[model samples]
Target: MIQRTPKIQVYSRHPAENGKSNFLNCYVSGFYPSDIEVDLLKNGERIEKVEHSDLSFSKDWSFYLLYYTEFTPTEKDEYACRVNHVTLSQPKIVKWDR
Candidate 1:
């Protein structure tokens, strides 16, 4: 069996502004075997309002998934994306940057 570790990206669809509306996006890609769990987190707690894009594949057969939500950012909140895949011994977490 071939296994590929996923690449994770956590970002806003547009440049973030304090108290302004924006979309939080988590893009996890390049994983193999297709069994994966993706979560959008706010300060380590899972958010229930996330929307997922349909699972898709790249030319190399590895899979990609996107989880996102509409959010407004504040000064004290930390946002993150977590991905669990069969290839990983531990989940991969990427923090969103301003």
Candidate 2:
């Protein structure tokens, strides 16, 4: 088994005060299995998935982004990203105004 160390950074809140859309971007690195899979969750619901092959990896780093627009995000909104069978990072609250 390969040891993976994935790190994530999110733009949870839009810079514009009245912005309606929220976005998240993640960057992952370290040794990952060939069957690697990435998934995004919002409010405990799986919203998106990206295959490891589809991801661009260089120097052991992989990057991904997720955006939400169907619903207005509140402080209660929770979002996270999962890699393979491991949860790389913790969920972050959505900010309406930056």
Candidate 3:
């Protein structure tokens, strides 16, 4: 069985500004086997307000997921995205840098 690890990216839709509304995006791609778990977190806690695109596939049948949430960026707050897949020995967390 061949398994592909996921590529993760965490970024804001626009340049971040404290107290301004923005989109926090987590894009996970190129993972195989179609079994994946994605979570958006703020300050290490799971964020409740999130939306995601439907599971998508590429020409090679590898899967991808896009998860995003509307957030007001604050100077002291931290953000990250968590991903889990069979190919990974443990869940991976990607942090957002401002």
Candidate 4:
């Protein structure tokens, strides 16, 4: 058996006709040992006033999740997603800017 470490990516998506809101997520994908945890942080503080779901599985035969949340960033907000799993000794924190 092989242990799979998560491959993570982050991005911002501007609102579109097909989509309704300008959103972004700490998109985590292709991981095994399914239990996963994610933290949305700003200025080293946890934010919960926005709509977000943690560690959602995309579908059968796929190992991925979209941590849907608000990206209505101001000029002073620092956003990061800290991903934690048994695959590593510590959480992997990923940042984004756009």
Candidate 5:
């Protein structure tokens, strides 16, 4: 198995310029096995589950996005992604400015 640390990137944007909501674009490196599953956690709560696709290996990474329509996020909020129970990335603190 490859032991390289994957690169993860998250970008926050508002779908509607004036909407009180945010969206996230998550990216993780492709070196991880295709069997690896990505889970999104918010404020210590599991929110979503995403599977690795064949396209993930075609490129060098995979991309995912999470949208929050009711939560605007605060300094106390935390977001994270995990693979096979192992955290490949650090918990991200959302900022209004992205």
Candidate 6:
């Protein structure tokens, strides 16, 4: 059994109703196993879920999933994501910067 670490990515380019609005978009993927839980933290506070995350398999055999969350920038805000898995000593945290 080969365990893998999760990957984190962040961006702010999305399609909005009125033209295009840019919000902090974050997605965590390329992780092994299914006991992992994803968290979205904005400005250091854990908040809202924009989309549901489910596990997916690729041609290789490594398990992965894309957990998505989006948030509009505030006066003083930051974007980040957290990965919680049994394989880690502590939850892996990554910050998104523009």
Local accuracy of candidate 5 as per-residue lDDT tens digits, 44-90? 56665433323334343543223232345566676655434133454
Candidate with better TM-score, 5 vs 6: 6
Candidate 3 regions exceeding 4 Å error are: none
The parts of candidate 2 lying over 4 Å away from their true place are: 1-5, 8-19, 48-54, 59-72, 85-98
- Clashing pairs for predicted structure model 2, backbone only: none
Question: Judged by TM-score relative to the true structure, which candidate is superior, 2 or 6?
Answer: 6
Per-candidate TM vs. native? 0.93, 0.48, 0.93, 0.73, 0.50, 0.72
Give candidate 6 regions above 4 Å deviation: 14-20
All candidates: CA RMSD in angstroms?
A: 1.1, 5.6, 1.2, 4.7, 5.4, 3.7
Of models 3 and 5, which has the larger lDDT? 3
Which residue pairs clash within candidate 3?
Answer: none
Q: Please state the error at residue 20 of candidate 2 in Å.
A: 1.8
Give the number of the best model, judged by lDDT: 3
lDDT tens digits by residue: candidate 6, 1-98: 55777676766665433333456555656567657877778777777755654667775646666546645565466667777876778988877666
Which of the two candidates, 1 or 3, achieves a greater lDDT against the reference?
Answer: 3
Candidate 1, poorest ten consecutive residues by summed lDDT: 58-67
The deviation in Å at residue 80 for candidate 5 is 1.6
Error of 4 at 3 (Å): 1.6
**Please, what are the lDDT tens digits per residue for candidate 4 over residues 1-98?**
44568887766666322224456577777777778777777778676754444555544434667675665666576778788877868999888655
Candidate 1 is scored at a TM of 0.93
Worst 10 residues of 3 by lDDT: 57-66
1 or 5: which has the higher TM-score?
Answer: 1
| Model 3 TM-score on a 0 to 1 scale | 0.93
